[PDB]
């Protein structure tokens, strides 16, 4: 783990709360002093106590590949602790949480440009982790964090989020990635409401395999629902590739004069 992950001196880091339950153990928000001595906000991912040996394998594992990335909208790793217990991954602290809590809490209070904001850095961030040949698997609203900026960083802690050959075989790639991403679309200009709400998984499999897609959300620019629906392509080499999609965001930030098109599953 430490080819790409630091250890940190457990000195430099203190606790200032409890802010979840991960999947390994809990996570905290705390401080971390730098070696340079500059202090940062950092959350702290705990692995849990009477862990067994596989249990850690996995857990830093997250840190070996997170250590991989250096990217603005790509979650920071600082770094790990493992010559010492709890053992721990330090990351960089986001003030507003998950994008599709914090989206929910604020239900039509932003303005068109803001919301493709943040589209636009995830679909950065999707670039970089997609040119670094990795494919996320598990891109949704719920992994994507956002910091008192609104700047938001792609993460990792699902058949709503999954492409039809992905379901179908495992075919996953970064067009697969690509399929996640329009549903994390869908999932922010709906303030985050749940994909494909609580249909049987069964019938979402069969619905969106039948050419049935997410409806637009209300007040929903017809390009960033074009969007969605290129990149629900059921042919997955018809899909955008990530830099277009960084490109077509871009666009739109140039031109809200373009957004003023506005436009149960759709077929
Ligand atoms: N508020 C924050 O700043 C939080 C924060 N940084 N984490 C956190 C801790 C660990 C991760 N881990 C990863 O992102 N792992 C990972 C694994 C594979 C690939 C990637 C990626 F590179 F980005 F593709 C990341 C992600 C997020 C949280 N996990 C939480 C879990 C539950 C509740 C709140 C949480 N808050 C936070």
Same mark, same amino acid.
């Given at each position: ?5 630091? @250890? ?8 200032? !709360?409890?802010? +979840?339950? +991960? ?5 905290? &928000? ?8 500059? @202090?940062?906000?950092?959350?702290? !991912? ?9 249990? *850690? ?5 997250? %840190? ?36 599709? &809590?914090?989206? *929910? ?15 636009? +850095? ?15 698997? $598990? ?9 008192? #900026? ?14 039809? @050959? ?8 970064? %067009? ?45 620019? %017809? ?11 059921? $042919? *997955?080499?018809?899909?955008? !590739? ?7 965001? $871009? ?12 436009? #149960?599953?759709?077929?």
């Amino acid at each position: 783990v430490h080819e790409f992950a630091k @250890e940190l001196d457990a000195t430099n880091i203190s606790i200032d !709360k409890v802010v +979840g339950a +991960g999947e390994f153990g809990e996570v905290c &928000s705390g401080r971390l002093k730098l070696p340079s001595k500059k @202090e940062i906000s950092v959350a702290i !991912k705990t692995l849990k106590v009477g862990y067994t040996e596989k249990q *850690r394998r996995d857990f830093l594992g997250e %840190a070996s590949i997170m250590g991989q990335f250096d990217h603005p909208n790509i979650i920071r790793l600082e770094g790990v602790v493992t010559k010492s217990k709890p053992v721990m991954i330090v990351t960089e602290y986001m003030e507003n949480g998950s994008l599709d &809590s914090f989206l *929910r809490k604020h239900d039509a209070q932003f303005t068109v440009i803001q919301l493709v904001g943040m589209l636009r +850095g995830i679909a950065s961030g999707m670039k970089y982790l997609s040119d670094m040949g990795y494919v996320h698997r $598990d891109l949704a609203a719920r992994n994507i964090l956002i910091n008192s #900026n609104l700047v938001c960083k792609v993460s990792d802690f699902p058949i709503r989020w999954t492409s039809p @050959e992905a379901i179908a075989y495992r075919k996953f790639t970064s %067009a697969s990635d690509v399929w996640s991403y329009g549903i994390v679309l869908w999932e922010v200009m709906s303030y985050g409401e749940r994909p494909y709400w609580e249909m049987s998984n069964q019938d979402v499999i069969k619905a969106v395999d039948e050419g049935y897609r997410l409806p637009p959300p209300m007040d929903c620019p %017809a390009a960033l629902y074009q969007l969605m629906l290129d990149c629900w392509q059921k $042919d *997955r080499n018809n899909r955008p !590739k990530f830099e277009q999609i960084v490109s077509i965001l $871009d666009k739109l930030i140039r031109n809200p004069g373009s957004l003023k098109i506005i436009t #149960n599953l759709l077929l």
